[PDB]
Design a protein around this ligand. Structure first.
Ligand code: CDL
Ligand code: PC1
Ligand code: PC1
Ligand code: 3PE
Ligand code: 3PE
Ligand code: 3PE
Ligand code: MYR
Lengths: 65, 155, 177, 128, 558, 459, 122
């Protein structure tokens, strides 16, 4: 039996469409939290970005004259 | 069709104007021709240049897509003012105000891209360094000649 | 302005049409339903403030600057109904609206596929052709000298007759073929 | 007060903001009634032929025939060569021809001068 | 070797077989749309094997199988280029088209010309895979004009409607203005390089290649709806929903971007072409995303979305990152086809209602449609580790860290915020809040065709960026070192767009009525660009086409 | 060539001794057999032309025009047999005799070894065409066209006659084979300038040239369908064939005498295409499209590169087929609505779906959809004119926008939109009409498979 | 990103321009500076068909990673550490580019303070 059209009220819902929609919403947040738990660097950062001012003049070769 | 419903020369006398307005099936007061400068319009009525998009859509038309009736003297550029083409309809913003906003927006975006091309952004790095004499044989250098040494050093 | 029956718009019609267009463009401005319903009663109050204006020249001027108010406050893309002109589904099925006379051009092998339909269509056409001369001689004695003044047509007066100029209005295609 | 709407060639004034739409005078009643009368008479003359069963063909529209005869036939016999017609037939008639003539002649003289001086890169140009 | 080329040609011949079936018909069909959907499913399965054996070794080839013409130095052969671009585009296009046709078996069920519709949609697919596999400019021009003409025929599907014919002729006009530049490029390569083949173009490697690249940029402007030649892509929403889903979001409109990605060894040695692509792409991705902020038709909003994503693709070509642009094409196809499918599911459920101001309350009425629309919007905006993260964010991670036009970068970031703005605008006016649609509820989505068709592109929109970006080889070096305010750029700008548009949406519940601002009138009437030029440029043509051309000269004087 | 002239002449006792109900069937059958015979002319060689006799020869330029000419006669007999049904039988046989005589003149116009026999047959083709147009044209109003035909005779064919007699006295021959090896350079002088204009202006009006195209949207309108088919398909292409023969003698003065007329065509195709956007008359729209396509052939002959000649002869064959099909579609609506007004009968895809498919295919070949030979000719001409000057691509490409614009407009106006209400005589498509559209279109589509037979002598 | 403000709003005399640098010798300030060693042979990266942008001073990690990517089909998640090695050494190459940039900026500061010391003294 199909979904009957209704008037000025909430339409009929199937159990299957609701559990599939909740299942794919859970799949979205599962995959987001999973790849955020394992990678954590594609969003935040892979390697440290060094400070240029914190480098010494000997490794860069600046003789003071 | 016969001759006395076909267009003719420019109406000079008012009785020829009345005969044409009876021929073109409209009021004599509304019937104005194109001005006789010799451009060959003849005695055709100068309709006031309204696009067919502007018409009443809910009106019972003879030609619903054209929004046009039977026996109505059509516009001279009726092929031009169809709803697939040129429209003259009113707009919410003024015409010159649209032209000013469009020209200012387009020219200002062009000028800002010219400013950003004048002053480019980059990274606090040196140039990318490649081995083997700036990859001389890879970039199409001939094997018989030998270039200058492109040597990069550790840092 | 441009109407089939009247040659103009009465001032009462102009007021009602401006009120309707103002509410429609307002609902376009005012998307939510309780918010539009609040502003709709406010605008109804603004229209009923000068409902009882006797002076037609003063009401003409008030209507004119009300048109200026409506033009100053209009939405650029108002809500057009889908099958309303300017809508997204407007005149969509006009490519499916085949005129009825094309059934006359069918081959008899496919006319025989629907025997009851064309066997009834024969007496529909019979009805039309014995109604035509009676409704022509109806229209020729009621129309004044100089042609008819207004585009409206008289109805069927005698019993047994049909209303004049009726076949394309009755046998028009469905809006969803 | 409010910004007044500016009409244009491609942006016409609305029916609501035109002042002459709000005419109440009896001569406007006469003009509107005569327009309604001509339109109703032409509507009746159309749909007596349109709803006729004995007619099977084309309801010929002499306004349409008159429009096509104006767009095709009436162009030459109502011409008069004067200052306006001759100057406008000399502007858009022999103007852009001369324009593209000098543009293409200039570019081809430039290209020929570069080829006979060995300048133009005509290296892999063997299809022509 | 004998497997790769064989299944490559079997895919295209298999796509052409239902065209012979629909042309050799006498009976009334035993579900010809199911036959075409089964055929395109199997063509997907067939094209999966050359893609997998490309990911195994990197195996590219050319099939110059049929000699067609020899104009004295130009041997035009039927030549198919199976490279990385074909091996990643053909399974994505066949997968998306398979979902679009299982969608169309539900959506286009009331149409009595359903066999003509599936025929035209298959003809589009054939011309598009002629385009993306062509090895010379001539076969690419065949596929190019083919997708232009099938665009015409599928915009003007309801050919009785005046606006559909108008939009179709508009799209043909702007595409032929792009074809001016495409034929300019073909003319330049034939005269200066004696070839239309890609291999001789790439091997000769010309240096004075500003003029053919300007021709190709004009071609991509006409085809991918870049600024100046853009408005036909919003006009082209007058066609049916699976037309706008397949063609004008994900498959046809990437072909100008694909044309510029295809010619990457010329663009990587021409900085001027890169700068012009960067400026034009930033202009388009600003303008169309700004126009999307104040629209109310949902098909118009998602068309401005896909044109802003095309402008971003043009941006990331313009920073000399073509493979990221093509990864963004393959990524963008999934969630943008799914967003058009979910919008059209709302449209067909709400009885041809497309205006978002008469929607709402569909979070619990259409749950699967709401789920997939939220997933498509979040993949569009750059939610972390959806498919749209694996390309678009990297685009920003190369748009910041490169020798770049600074204003193009700033407009790219403003576009990145605007994507979040119109995405949560769609979710606000269409899914959230209280209902605004009329009273006779016929809301329903429980057809396995609709649910499975959105489901497979949902699996794509969740997993396909991860799967593809871990299956594609490196062709550039990914710039992975940047400061933390520069690494967190795209995410923060996207969340700022969400916050700003949520404040805008919560200013609408207030009982205040403001007069319209000039920014609202500008963005709502589409930068005033389709209002002026669609009136002025026809006028100045047609009067000039009548007064002086016909009447004055060619009937009287001459 | 005498295995083609004699069957074409035997079509005269075939058409006058046939029974009264059989005269269309017999002429259609035997003209289709002649068109099947016409493929023996494909014995071409990469060095030598096919040289039959002292009087007739065939290179790869004349051969496809011959095949198109011998193919055009059955199609004209199909197209013109409906509106001659109430005609007298003897007048009907006179019509068929004038068609056969026009084919007879054309198939030895294209094979003319010597140039004054080309001139005699070239100006012989005008007389049966004139009689077909003015005896079966259904209305004749030619007050301005008489003076234009006088201008054609003054500025055209008569200076060509005097110039060819002058070459006969100077070179000693007008054999094109001899003139391949005895050609002298035609240097810069005023005598050679009037020589160039005399050798070229007849063929300039026959193409037609822009500014000289005033006859063609009249003569196409006032003609029957067979007359419009043979004007669009063959009789314009006599000018291009004659230019490609006579420009052998006009070197190197052509290299600076082409510059005015090239402008007249390069701007001219911008105008006439634009003129097609404002046509009320559908048949006039197809006429101005024919001008807008023959302008490219004029440019491609005047720039005289190999790619331009290949594109020009491919464009000539393709446009012959395409514009003949367009006039036949225009007649297939005119025989129903009895008016040529393009805005009269609209929305015809609702009523005639297969005929609207033929309209779609003829429009796509009209706007040069690849890989059709319309596009191959268009494209090769555009490549060669880019080699001539790199700016002309603009004037090419802008034309290639407007050529699309009126092609679909003609599709959108006539076939799409809402159907006209007061027209109820729209019959279904007769099998004759669909056969006529297919015998136009299917050869045009099959020539995309093997275009090398329509690319001229220097393929 | 602050150096963009230092070069545009400040002076471009002390900020090293991106297009042509180093403007200083490589031995200037470096006693016995050594070259940059290339690990992968020219013929080895020739046969590995690497992109000309990818044949830098650390393409040998990329060759090991691509060999792992070919050999681990269909398990496309089995060579994360080889990609990590290549990305880390590209990161170190970028750090060396940053060190070259900071060297050039500090030697231009040396030149600026040198001419200011000369204008103060002489
Ligand atoms: C030598 C042997 C060769 C064998 C192979 C054949 C080679 C080509 C031959 C001709 C191909 C076209 C034939 C059909 C079209 C004409 C008739 C028609 O309209 O029928 C509709 C009808 C189907 O429609 P319907 O629903 O039944 O009724 C009509 C509808 O009411 C209303 O119709 P509708 O609107 O629903 O549908 C119309 C639709 C409308 O669709 C379109 O308009 C879309 C077309 C354009 C876009 C797509 C194509 C773009 C280009 C790419 C493809 C070409 C290159 C591919 C190669 C690889 C890449 C380079 O058209 C089609 O579906 C036609 C399909 C083929 C189109 C070809 C291109 C036409 C575009 C213009 C020219 C383009 C360049 C030249 C192409 C040359 C190709 C060789 O078809 C038939 O009934 C078929 C009749 C029999 C056809 C026989 C074909 C062969 C004839 C040659 C005989 C001699 C050789 C012997 C071979 C025999 C083989 C059996
Ligand atoms: C169900 C249908 C299938 C058939 C079933 C029954 C037969 C069983 C299968 C076996 C078939 C027979 C054996 C194989 C075929 C013969 C192979 C062979 O050598 O054939 C000779 C040739 C091969 O070419 P070639 O190189 O030998 O010779 C070319 C000819 N010259 C040199 C003169 C120029 O022809 C073919 O193979 C023809 C088939 C081609 C297939 C593609 C056709 C596309 C048409 C598009 C038209 C427009 C093109 C535009 C684009 C051009 C490029 C940009
Ligand atoms: C088309 C518009 C021009 C048509 C001109 C008339 C036909 C000329 C045919 C070619 C004749 C010829 O050999 O010309 C060279 C001859 C040259 O004379 P000649 O060839 O006897 O001289 C001996 C050779 N030279 C030149 C080295 C001394 O030209 C003429 O004699 C006059 C040519 C012009 C004709 C003027 C009358 C007609 C005007 C236009 C009417 C249209
Ligand atoms: C990367 C480089 C970028 C360079 C950018 C600058 C160059 C390009 C400049 C812009 C050119 C295109 C814009 C102007 C023409 C647009 C015409 C058009 O699209 O018309 C659409 C119009 C209907 O539009 P609309 O009002 O939306 O309809 C729906 C409701 N009526 O439809 C109609 O009114 C129907 C009209 C039919 C006839 C059209 C006549 C005009 C033809 C214009 C040809 C332009 C050729 C340009 C060639 C350039 C060569 C270099
Ligand atoms: C991705 C990570 C998302 C979570 C981190 C960002 C959180 C944040 O700043 O959210 C801002 C805002 C919530 O704050 P606000 O709406 O002002 O207050 C009412 C709270 N329900 O708004 C939101 O949380 C809604 C927007 C979230 C965007 C997610 C996709 C990016
Ligand atoms: C009208 C219908 C529609 C259009 C169709 C075409 C009609 C016109 C056809 C002819 C077109 C123009 C004439 C051809 C121009 C070719 C170049 C040329 O003659 O340039 C002008 C000339 C320049 O001098 P120059 O060429 O050096 O003369 C010495 C020659 N040995 O300048 C001069 O010598 C000065 C002028 C002298 C008079 C020349 C008259 C003869 C040409 C027209 C006939
Ligand atoms: C210097 O600022 C280097 C960074 C690149 C140029 C400036 C980019 C500014 C915009 C991006 C960061 C925005 C953070 C909200």
């Amino acid at each position: 039996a199909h979904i009957e059209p209704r008037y000025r009220q909430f339409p009929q819902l199937t159990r299957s469409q609701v559990i599939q929609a909740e299942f794919f919403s859970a799949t979205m947040w599962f995959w987001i939290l999973w790849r955020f738990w394992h990678d954590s660097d594609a969003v935040l950062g892979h390697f440290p970005y060094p400070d240029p001012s914190q480098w010494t003049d000997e490794e860069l070769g600046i003789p003071p004259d | 069709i016969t001759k006395d419903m076909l267009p003719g020369p420019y109406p000079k006398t008012p009785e020829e104007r009345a005969a044409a307005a009876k021929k073109y099936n409209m009021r004599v007061e509304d019937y104005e021709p194109y001005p006789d400068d010799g451009m060959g319009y003849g005695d055709y009525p100068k309709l006031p240049d309204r696009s067919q998009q502007e018409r009443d859509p809910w009106y019972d038309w003879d030609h619903p897509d054209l929004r046009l009736n039977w026996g109505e003297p059509m516009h001279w550029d009726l092929d031009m003012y169809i709803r697939n083409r040129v429209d003259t309809s009113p707009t919410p913003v003024n015409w010159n105000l649209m032209c000013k906003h469009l020209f200012g927006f387009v020219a200002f975006m062009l000028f800002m891209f010219w400013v950003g091309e004048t002053y480019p952004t980059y990274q606090p790095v040196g140039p990318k360094q490649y081995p083997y004499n700036n990859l001389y044989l890879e970039r199409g250098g001939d094997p018989n000649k030998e270039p200058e040494p492109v040597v990069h050093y550790e840092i | 302005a441009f109407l089939p029956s009247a040659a103009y718009l009465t001032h009462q019609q102009k007021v009602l049409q401006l009120y309707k267009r103002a509410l429609r463009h307002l609902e376009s401005r005012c998307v939510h339903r309780d918010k539009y319903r609040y502003f709709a009663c406010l605008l109804r109050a603004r229209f009923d403030e000068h409902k009882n204006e006797k002076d037609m020249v003063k009401a003409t001027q008030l209507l004119r600057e009300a048109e200026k108010e409506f033009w100053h406050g209009q939405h650029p893309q108002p809500y057009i109904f889908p099958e309303s002109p300017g809508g997204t589904s407007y005149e969509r099925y006009e490519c499916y609206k085949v005129p009825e006379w094309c059934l006359d051009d069918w081959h008899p092998s496919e006319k025989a596929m629907y025997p009851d339909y064309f066997a009834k269509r024969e007496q529909w056409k019979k009805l039309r052709r014995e109604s035509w001369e009676r409704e022509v001689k109806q229209l020729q004695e009621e129309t004044p000298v100089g042609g008819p003044r207004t585009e409206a047509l008289p109805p069927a007066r005698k019993q047994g007759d049909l209303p004049p100029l009726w076949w394309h209005i009755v046998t028009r295609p469905r809006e969803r073929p | 007060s409010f910004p007044k709407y500016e009409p244009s060639r491609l942006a016409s004034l609305p029916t609501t903001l035109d002042p002459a739409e709000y005419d109440i005078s009896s001569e406007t009643r006469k003009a509107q009634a005569e327009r309604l009368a001509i339109r109703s008479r032409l509507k009746r003359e159309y749909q007596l032929q349109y709803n006729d069963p004995s007619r099977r063909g084309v309801v010929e529209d002499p306004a349409l025939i008159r429009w096509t005869c104006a767009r095709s036939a009436n162009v030459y016999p109502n011409f008069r060569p004067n200052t306006k017609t001759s100057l406008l037939g000399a502007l858009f008639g022999i103007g852009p021809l001369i324009f593209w003539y000098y543009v293409f002649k200039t570019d081809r003289d430039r290209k020929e001068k570069l080829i006979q001086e060995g300048k133009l890169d005509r290296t892999f140009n063997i299809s022509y | 070797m004998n497997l790769f080329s064989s299944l490559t040609l079997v895919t295209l011949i298999l796509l052409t077989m239902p065209i012979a079936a629909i042309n050799f018909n006498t009976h009334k069909f035993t579900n010809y749309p199911l036959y075409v959907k089964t055929t395109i499913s199997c063509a997907f399965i067939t094209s999966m094997i050359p893609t997998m054996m490309f990911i195994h070794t990197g195996q590219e080839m050319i099939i110059s199988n049929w000699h067609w013409l020899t104009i004295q130095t130009l041997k035009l052969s039927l030549s198919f280029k199976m490279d990385f671009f074909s091996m990643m585009f053909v399974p994505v296009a066949l997968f998306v088209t398979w979902s679009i046709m299982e969608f169309s078996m539900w959506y286009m069920h009331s149409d009595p010309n359903i066999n003509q519709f599936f025929k035209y949609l298959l003809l589009f697919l054939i011309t598009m895979l002629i385009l993306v596999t062509a090895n010379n400019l001539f076969q690419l021009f065949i596929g190019w004009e083919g997708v232009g003409i099938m665009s015409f025929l599928l915009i003007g599907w309801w050919y009785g409607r005046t606006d559909a014919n108008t939009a179709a002729l508009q799209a043909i006009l702007y595409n032929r203005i792009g074809d001016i530049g495409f034929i300019l490029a073909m003319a330049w390569f034939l005269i200066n390089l004696n070839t239309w083949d890609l291999q001789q173009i790439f091997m000769l490697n010309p240096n004075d290649s500003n003029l053919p690249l300007m021709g190709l940029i004009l071609a991509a402007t006409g085809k991918s709806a870049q600024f100046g030649l853009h408005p036909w892509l919003p006009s082209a929403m007058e066609g049916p929903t699976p037309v706008s889903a397949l063609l004008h979001s994900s498959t046809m409109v990437v072909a100008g971007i694909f044309l510029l990605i295809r010619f990457y060894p010329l663009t990587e040695n021409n900085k001027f072409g890169q700068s012009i692509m960067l400026c034009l792409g930033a202009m388009t991705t600003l303008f169309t995303a700004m126009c999307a902020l104040t629209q109310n038709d949902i098909k118009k909003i998602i068309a401005f979305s896909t044109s802003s994503q095309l402008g971003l693709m043009m941006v990331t070509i313009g920073i000399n990152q073509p493979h990221l642009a093509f990864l963004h094409i393959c990524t963008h196809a999934f969630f943008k086809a799914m967003l058009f499918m979910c919008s059209g599911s709302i449209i067909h459920s709400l009885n041809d209602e497309q205006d978002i101001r008469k929607m709402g309350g569909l979070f619990k009425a259409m749950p699967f449609t709401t789920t997939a629309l939220i997933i498509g919007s979040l993949a569009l905006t750059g939610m972390p580790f959806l498919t749209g993260f694996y390309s678009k964010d990297l685009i920003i991670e190369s748009a910041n860290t490169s020798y770049t036009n600074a204003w193009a970068l700033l407009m790219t970031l403003v576009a990145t915020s605007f994507t979040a703005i119109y995405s949560t605008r769609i979710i606000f006016f269409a899914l959230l809040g209280q209902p605004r649609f009329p009273t006779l509820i016929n809301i329903n989505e429980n057809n396995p065709f609709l649910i499975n068709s959105i489901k497979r592109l949902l699996i794509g929109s969740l997993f396909a960026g991860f799967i593809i970006s871990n299956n594609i080889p490196p062709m550039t070096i990914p710039q992975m070192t940047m400061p933390h305010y520069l690494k967190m750029t795209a995410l923060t700008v996207t969340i700022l767009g969400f916050i700003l548009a949520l404040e805008i949406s919560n200013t609408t519940h207030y009982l205040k009525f403001n007069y319209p601002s000039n920014t609202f009138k500008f963005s709502n009437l589409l930068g005033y660009y389709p209002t002026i030029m669609h009136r002025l440029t026809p006028y100045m043509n047609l009067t000039m086409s009548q007064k002086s051309a016909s009447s004055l000269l060619d009937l009287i004087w001459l | 060539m005498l295995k083609y002239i004699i069957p074409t002449m035997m079509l005269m006792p075939l058409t006058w001794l046939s029974k009264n109900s059989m005269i269309w069937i017999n002429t259609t059958l035997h003209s289709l057999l002649i068109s099947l015979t016409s493929l023996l002319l494909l014995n071409q060689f990469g060095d030598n032309s096919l040289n039959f006799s002292l009087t007739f020869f065939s290179d790869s330029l004349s051969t496809p025009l011959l095949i198109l000419t011998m193919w055009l006669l059955p199609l004209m007999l199909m197209a013109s047999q409906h509106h001659l049904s109430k005609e007298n039988l003897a007048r009907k046989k006179l019509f068929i005799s004038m068609l056969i005589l026009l084919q007879l003149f054309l198939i030895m116009t294209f094979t003319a070894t010597e140039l004054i026999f080309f001139y005699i047959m070239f100006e012989a083709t005008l007389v049966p065409t004139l009689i077909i147009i003015t005896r079966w044209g259904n209305q004749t109003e030619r007050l301005n066209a008489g003076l234009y035909f006088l201008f054609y005779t003054l500025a055209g064919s008569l200076p060509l006659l005097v110039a060819l007699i002058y070459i006969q006295n100077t070179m000693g021959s007008l054999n094109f084979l001899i003139l391949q090896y005895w050609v002298q350079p035609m240097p810069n002088s005023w005598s050679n300038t009037f020589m160039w204009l005399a050798c070229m202006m007849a063929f300039m009006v026959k193409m037609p040239l822009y500014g000289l195209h005033l006859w063609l949207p009249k003569a196409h309108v006032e003609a029957p369908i067979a007359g419009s088919m043979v004007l669009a398909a063959i009789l314009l292409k006599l000018g291009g064939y004659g230019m490609m023969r006579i420009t052998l003698l006009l070197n190197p003065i052509t290299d600076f005498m082409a510059y005015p007329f090239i402008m007249l065509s390069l701007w001219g195709m911008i105008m006439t295409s634009s003129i097609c956007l404002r046509q009320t008359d559908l048949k006039s729209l197809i006429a101005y499209s024919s001008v807008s396509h023959m302008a490219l052939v004029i440019v491609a002959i005047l720039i005289q590169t190999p790619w331009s000649y290949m594109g020009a002869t491919a464009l000539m064959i393709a446009h012959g087929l395409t514009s003949s099909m367009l006039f036949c579609l225009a007649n297939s609506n005119y025989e129903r609505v009895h008016s040529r007004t393009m805005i009269l009968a609209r929305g015809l895809q609702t009523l005639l779906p297969l005929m609207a498919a033929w309209w779609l295919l003829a429009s796509l070949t009209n706007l040069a959809l690849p890989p059709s030979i319309n596009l191959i000719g268009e494209l090769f001409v555009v490549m060669s004119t880019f080699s001539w000057s790199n700016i002309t691509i603009i004037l090419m490409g802008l034309n290639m926008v407007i050529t699309a614009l009126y092609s679909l407009y003609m599709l959108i106006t006539t076939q799409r939109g809402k159907h006209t209400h007061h027209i109820n005589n729209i019959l279904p498509s007769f099998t004759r009409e669909n056969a006529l559209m297919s015998l136009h279109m299917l050869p045009l589509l099959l020539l995309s498979l093997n275009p090398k037979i329509i690319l001229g002598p220097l393929y | 990103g602050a150096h963009l403000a230092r070069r545009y709003l400040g002076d471009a005399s002390v900020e090293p321009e991106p297009l042509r640098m180093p403007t200083f010798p490589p031995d200037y300030g470096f006693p016995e500076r050594k070259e940059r060693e290339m690990v992968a042979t020219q013929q080895e990266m020739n046969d590995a068909q690497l992109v000309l942008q990818q044949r830098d001073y650390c393409a040998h990690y990329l060759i090991r990673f691509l060999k792992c990517k070919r050999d681990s089909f269909p398990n496309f998640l089995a060579c994360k550490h080889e990609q990590h090695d290549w990305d880390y050494c590209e990161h170190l190459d970028y750090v060396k580019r940053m060190k070259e940039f900071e060297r050039e900026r500090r030697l231009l500061q040396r030149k600026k303070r040198r001419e200011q010391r000369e204008a103060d003294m002489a």
